[PDB]
Design a protein around this ligand. Structure first.
Ligand SMILES: [Zn+2]
Ligand SMILES: [Zn+2]
Ligand SMILES: [Zn+2]
Ligand SMILES: [Zn+2]
Lengths: 234, 234, 234, 234
DNA sequence: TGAGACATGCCCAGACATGCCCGTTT
DNA sequence: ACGGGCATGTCTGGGCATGTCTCAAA
């Protein structure tokens, strides 16, 4: 009964931004990101890899926090949590509170929090600089409830806020992305990307023919990306 | 679940990288390598020769370590081990623990590790310079479970990470290859290479809507470039 | 798992059997019965009237009990209950425990049981003779979960067992009907009845080899008899 | 590996024998009995209902024991048990030892035994007379390994022996059925019934034509049952 | 000795299933 | 109070996956 956490995309001072691995679309992928909608479509309880990129490595003692909130204005004040059924569904990982939606894996330094005032749920981990001969970091998340579970998110879309903060809890950078947990991310991704391209499709669009869906896949990606760089100028 | 070791290729100061033989003489039925897929196909517990290349002789006490990790994101955090059935088998050489999938053959200096923190398994041997007259060092491996063993890999593909490290365990170099342990390497290699070919020789055409004049020309010469590379056969 | 109560129809000494109304006047959208399937389609928590027929008046202290069991063999041993979500709801009348799926409506004599040994739920009411001028007694039920509730019936079909018993619980009679609790009884009833029709509107012939004149005799007759039933209603 | 428990059918003084439910072969079925083969096809850990018939009630304290043995003479002396993988999993059931293949569902009076001399496993339950209106009693079993699990049954066919015995453990009756635990009961059942069919078919046969695939399969099952009863006369 | 021919657990694109929203209707 | 569209978790037919058996042949 306090307030909603900030979601303003703060690039930061270290050039903090997130990156996602490219996936297919056929019903087989337990996870697939949409650059066009900035939406991660994933299946229930399946590890989702998320990359962290930085210009200059932050100072030791920096951490990364993850939190979910309802993307719809009227529901934004409601604490996002697991439904009654899955709340009872005991998972092997006893390190993460059974009521939490977002979990981190492969990191024993992960700390799960329940704000003493806002009652919001979140998870935190230290910030590891890229590996010797690498270029980014990666944290593996898992979502323990479907977006449709009654008594839970009940068909309401959520947003995952990833904040880069220091030992105090000061803001050093913030990124975010919408998430949809569902049984068929491939199918569901297509449908939304289509309704997106079901409007604003008129004007001066030059047609181009491509051979193979694989090649077509690449060209579409690289092109829907350039339709964002220009969109950002708004 | 446990933290995932990096798999990013890194040649390092010594230009470290792997090489494989072109199996097609006698023992080319028990073990075969696919350059197109960068995947080794081999039978259970059969010798697998791997070549180590290095530009300059590494420092005294350099070691070579081999570790397997699941290739798919939803399984990356799970430790790769032998299934309960083969674990209680009597194929152990005495030097290698029964739970390890990967063994080194023909080297009594091989050491086996059960990471006390990540619980990951690995085998390590001291680095040895190439034999006089050659520019590579050969290391022989054996994989103790089929990729299909239930209770074990359970049909999940794996990636083998080979790292070059100093006497203290610091990374000097890294490379990797995919491995499928099966009863019919030849047949399975043919199948997978054919499925990869079909995905490249896809004649179905799809149209793309560009949103710019010059932007269109970018994809133009780019797509025609590819459409000309396909003339390699045509 | 728990022992499965019998579901075999048994009229007993009193010629006990159930009867349902032909919904098609006003409230025929919230609850409809299919004679062809012997299945009741009704909305969550909406009144379901059932008729009790008996040839001679049962003895003093006769009771009527209702219990649900899963219809499929792989689920028969699992107790039918309300899902966690609706269980914590505030729809309880005070008389019925929150975990019971089946409630009796309009009768403060209704009693609710949680079998201490089989853990099965059931509701019981005293037997009451038909109203003057009628030959049946009406009992009203309400089903507190959709057949689709996860954590509960989870899309598994159920069978409702109605038993007539003496003051001590001995079986005097038994009958039953299938129940699907859904949001659209009409639509779902149409769908299922159509799917049943197609399974009979199948005119594919097959030939059977029978050994022995008397056996052929038996089969021929059993077959020519089923033919009548087929053209019996066109 | 010494002796072998008898598998000879014996109705005894109470006319003891087994009955089974009638099922189709669609992919939807998790359990299906074949009369022509007297073989039960069921999926891993799924409920298998077995009916028990008797001509006259047995004495007080009578029990029913189930035990599995390998059908092929060259494996009969080997005890049937769970493979290393499934054994290594303490299933929710806290009454049955983890190494027992056969379990009984819904019966707290069930007792599991490890014979001190033969080392054979068996599960025993008290004989319960049918309820009023019923002609049989049913017991619900669960088989905890696939017939193909390596390290266990390893593709070897097994037979289940059901014996009726008095409070002192003396043989009152015996019957049996072959069991195949697999991922696709319907498919495998169809396959084996087809192999039997295209074999013993020869001689004088009357022809009957039937309309409808299901009616035909029902008639064919009835006819195959009678034909099995023929080959068991001489 | 190796390539068909089985044997047998799993996968998946395309329905099907099923609670809700919504504007028209008795 | 009713069909028609959506929204979405689940099902399945045909095929794929994959260890094992086999018989004729370098
Ligand atoms: Zn949930
Ligand atoms: Zn194995
Ligand atoms: Zn419910
Ligand atoms: Zn097993």
């Amino acid at each position: 009964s306090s307030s909603v956490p900030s979601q303003k995309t703060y690039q930061g001072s270290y050039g903090f931004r997130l990156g996602f691995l490219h996936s297919g679309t056929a019903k087989s992928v337990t996870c697939t990101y949409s650059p066009a909608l900035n939406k991660m479509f994933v299946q229930l309880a399946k590890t989702v890899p998320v990359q962290l990129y930085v210009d200059s490595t932050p100072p030791p003692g920096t951490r990364v926090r993850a939190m979910a909130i309802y993307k719809q204005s009227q529901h934004m004040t409601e604490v996002v949590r697991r439904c009654p059924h899955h709340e009872r569904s005991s998972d092997s990982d006893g390190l993460a509170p059974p009521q939490h939606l977002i979990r981190v894996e492969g990191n024993l330094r992960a700390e799960y929090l329940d704000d003493p005032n806002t009652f919001r749920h979140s998870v935190v981990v230290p910030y590891e600089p890229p590996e010797v001969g690498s270029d980014y970091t990666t944290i593996y998340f898992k979502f323990m409830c479907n977006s449709s579970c009654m008594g839970g998110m009940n068909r309401r879309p959520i947003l995952v806020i990833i904040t880069l903060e220091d030992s105090s809890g000061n803001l050093l950078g913030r990124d975010s992305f919408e998430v949809r947990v569902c049984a068929c991310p491939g199918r569901d991704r297509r449908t939304e990307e289509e309704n997106l391209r079901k409007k604003t499709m008129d004007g001066e669009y030059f047609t181009l023919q491509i051979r193979g869906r694989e090649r077509f896949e690449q060209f579409r990606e690289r092109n829907e990306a350039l339709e964002l760089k220009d969109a950002q100028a708004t």
